[PDB]
50S ribosomal protein L9
Amino acid sequence: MKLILTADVDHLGSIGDTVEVKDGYGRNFLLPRGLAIVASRGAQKQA
RNA sequence: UUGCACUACGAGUAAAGAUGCUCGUUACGCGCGGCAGGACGAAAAGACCCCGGGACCUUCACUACAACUUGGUAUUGAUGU
């Protein structure tokens, strides 16, 4: 699943390349950091 | 407690231990005080024995489950050799 970063991280990468999260490592780590989104209407606001 | 009733004894007979059957013997009728041999005395659908049901108990019986433990996957992530 691709998603929409805010800061460059050694797993996720840039903002908008190809996201390969580990299934929980996002909402327990990333989404508290305010650096990642579970994509709902984000594949075009990313643009 | 109670099927009766005017409820003898013997030797027998009978479900094998007779107040009631048989053959005899012995007893006027009723009553009150005693004993307690019998009435398979009363009580208590024998406690024992055996059959049938149940009960609880045990366990190198049966099958379950609890509980204790084993891993599998979800919550469970990163970076690294």
